Design an enzyme around this catalytic site. Structure first.
Site, short mmCIF file in Angstrom:
data_model
loop_
_atom_site.label_atom_id
_atom_site.label_comp_id
_atom_site.label_asym_id
_atom_site.label_seq_id
_atom_site.Cartn_x
_atom_site.Cartn_y
_atom_site.Cartn_z
CB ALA A 175 4.21 -8.11 7.80
CB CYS A 176 4.80 -3.28 4.68
SG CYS A 176 5.02 -2.45 6.29
#
Lengths: 309, 309, 309, 309
Positions: free
Chosen positions: A3-4
């Site tokens: 997740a970014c």
């Protein structure tokens, strides 16, 4: 899953600030690279070579390479996960650019999104990523222009424009925008999707980045962009098995060329003012160690250590 | 509208950590109060008097008084907005306890939620709040027991139990729980409401506080509780007119009696280790000024200034 | 805004049933067209001509023309609103096919989606729609294959496959699928978007059409598909100003070539069993009047009136 | 799980129309009961007796008894599932009213919600339900007043008022209203929960019942209320294991004392105009059989068969 989130704040009077989260599982360290440095795109494959026109401050994971940074022209490049990425079809014989150094190549050679894109559009090289790795890139310059670069089914795909302020993980950009469109019909004050899902983070970042105050005072814009990044972070150690939680945030003031950084584990926001840094060819490589639990604060140029790289 | 979230982390081996956000518009400062201090509940009305059995560290707004703190028995008391609050019906002749000092009264006189509640259940006094102010309280001790105290239509309403770990703003607690129940049917990994609305913050805080790692290592629990608080914060300066954004966060490690604090405007997390503080009667009042932009870091006992209060 | 939903049920043993809603503001009437009929695509522009290979039962609005029907090979064609449709760029000199007769052309000339598509892919003609009108089409044959046909920025766009079972209004199909993908990540038992919005109807129709029983008993499949259509209908006269509510539903059993129909204003479901209908060239055109409030029931072939068309 | 929705439309000029869905797994049949009929509340336990002041039309399941009906004063009573219902505490020695006949008792003896409530508030009897059954009731008269009656932890709980127009299944009414309140903050045009969950149906029914046209023309109000009921129905045979789908709908025009009814399995809406029915003591019991697949249409008084009950 990884997740970014990445989000560009476009303010008054060329105030351009880019926020980015890094969620994994990351072994990140920070490096200052003087310009005129000499680099090659690959260690085994036939590549391309260059010597870097601009110095840069960058963050790097142990096994990922350069995944985030700003160069002295205030250009920002960020490598975020996109699992469906496919860099080339079988039988591609072009020079190979390592996925681990692709970001550096961009930061080394370009001051403007316009030139970054024009070069990439030649498709001179292909991106090479080892098997047992799938990433897209977003680039934004100090005029606030942005490009989103993806490889889908071996084909290059680019969105260029100031309006492309947010990037997250899957799906592919064209589709991500449609999901965001749907949620804008609903209205961010009425409902926002509040999950750690790639598209939920996109929608919240996109809504809040446009909702924070239009200011040119970095004392306001920076902490604002940071509070957006905090909203789209993944709470720590989130398991409910192996969910990817935020480990660090970065915020790049591209107007004043300052690079802020915080760790979810370490108390404070620190930064590196690139205007106080010597990027001249002979200055030598420097490094901020983060893997040993180091706790920095305020300006951290002072804490820079020399490195034989 | 105001926005505050509070969430209690219940970990292994008596690890009890309480997080709290403060969103307004706040002029907050921090005060250390030695025990054996002498106080009255009101300056005009007929009141009740007491001398404080326990010392305490507390935060106070200019026009609100004591709105958050921990005492040396590690008991935590927090005053959050609840707009429908109605403290008494017309014609109430009991001794009056100022809303601005109610929290202090609790922190001064109680080590245990059990005793706090038993006392409040007598209904000896009434809460007095000036007209042109509406708040509920949550209290939790080091055993992790919690009470939520509300005044509805002039009647006292209390929920007591370890399970009551979260509190936000409206609606009244019984109803807030039903909204949370609804969202649990949906499942926090599938969908969470992602807005700054009082009930959305409740649902996310409630989901994440139970999802962070079960650890007794404060080096983990504290930053974890903090990342939950960051998830339910309101991004800064959010206007989209006059929406209330997070200005500060606090986290009370009630096991180790440490009190952490951060400002949305100031870079770092600082804290006050209550074990390093002299609470003996003659020690004298001390203060951490925050209204002058002061930037603290790490242990801030050193930075405590004397105050004539 | 307009609202129409279409959904194809794919059951066991070639059970293929297509449901469709019509929401407007519609002046719909039903027509039976014997085969070997002689038609032209336009009344002013240069067109294309044909004589119809298959007879058909169709529904038509006063100002819209043929917008829904099934032909004797059980092929179903449906014209639904898509506001962003753009049929050609300026300076298009091809033969013109009237938007009002496009559907009939399809039903007259094709037994199979495969042949419909192969023909349309030639792009022989262009679609002509008067200015002061924007529609996409979905076609499905008795093998359950479906094509979705859209015109975007003057370009033809087709999705062909059994999996393309649902169609609604905007956005363009590729994007609509992404929105549906997002909502499937969430899970239809956990949350469904419950609004009359084009994408909400898509998501619910798509979820329920796959959830109803896998049966080959029309006594079950038909009323099932109907209950899906009822779920994605827009409650009547919905104003909350000028919102488009469901006026009628149709359901085409493509296995048994039966065509069911109900009006939101009239009590009962009626139908036209195409196996009991004479489609031979000389049979003559027939009509079911609906604009005069007529109330039909069960088999309505009996109620067919002759028409000089 | 079971699913039933009930919604009262309050229109202009005493237009009062009550819609109700029945979702199960139901073996429903319809009965006309002349007045002056003689009944007892239980067959084994000590009960209460009465002779019915008003005739009534009612629907009954095989194993449930009377679960829905309207009496000749146009009063409507509906028994819907509420799993947490608890009718009495251990050791309750009052006369017992069978859960299967409770509804009939109400319809037999009351013309007005005001009198129904005043009587029930005496708590003369208790509700008796066999173990291996949990239901709440909603009553509305022709003035549009409504009462919701629930038994929680053996205690009687009533909400009375025109504003209480909707009822569904769990949670208990006070809490159900809070969930609805939450969703109204969000706004029904922005987002509605679109699931078959008890609270989702409540929210949609509550939103749409207030959104349909304010008309006194039954030709409009009735089909409108019906389209609301269709929106909150559960698509047929929905399994995705054993989910409860809508089997029938009823709509009671309480102004004109007409009782409409449709089966999800049978094509048409039929009805029983109570003004065309003889409710005089000697008229004798009549019945509409539905368990044999009977297909009724329009006025169905004609189809009434005599029954020895």
């Amino acid at each position: 899953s990884n997740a970014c989130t990445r989000a560009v704040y476009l303010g008054p009077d060329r105030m351009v600030v880019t926020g980015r989260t890094m969620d994994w599982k990351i072994m990140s360290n920070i490096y200052v690279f003087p310009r005129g440095m000499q680099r090659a795109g690959h260690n085994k494959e036939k590549t391309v070579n260059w010597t870097s026109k601009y110095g840069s401050v960058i963050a790097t994971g142990y096994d990922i390479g350069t995944c985030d940074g700003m160069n002295e022209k205030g250009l920002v490049a960020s490598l975020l996960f996109l699992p469906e990425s496919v860099y080339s079809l079988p039988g591609d014989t072009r020079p190979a650019m390592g996925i681990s150094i692709w970001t550096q190549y961009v930061l080394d050679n370009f001051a403007t999104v316009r030139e970054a894109v024009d070069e990439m559009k030649k498709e001179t090289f292909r991106i090479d990523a080892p098997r047992m790795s799938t990433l897209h890139m977003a680039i934004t310059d100090e005029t606030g222009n942005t490009a989103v670069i993806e490889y889908l089914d071996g084909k290059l795909s680019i969105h260029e424009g100031k309006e492309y302020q947010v990037m997250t993980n899957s799906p592919r950009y064209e589709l991500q925008l449609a999901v965001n469109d749907y949620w804008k019909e609903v209205g961010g004050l009425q409902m926002l999707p509040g999950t750690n899902r790639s598209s939920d983070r996109f929608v919240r970042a996109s809504f809040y980045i446009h909702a924070i105050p239009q200011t040119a005072d970095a004392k306001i814009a920076v902490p604002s962009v940071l509070s957006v990044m905090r909203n789209v972070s993944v709470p720590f150690g989130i398991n409910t098995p192996h969910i990817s939680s935020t480990r660090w945030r970065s915020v790049s003031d591209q107007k004043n060329k300052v690079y802020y950084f915080e760790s979810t584990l370490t108390p404070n926001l620190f930064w590196l003012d690139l205007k106080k840094i010597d990027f001249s060819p002979k200055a030598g490589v420097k490094k901020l160690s983060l893997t040993k639990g180091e706790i920095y604060a305020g300006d951290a140029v002072k804490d820079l250590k020399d490195s034989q790289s």
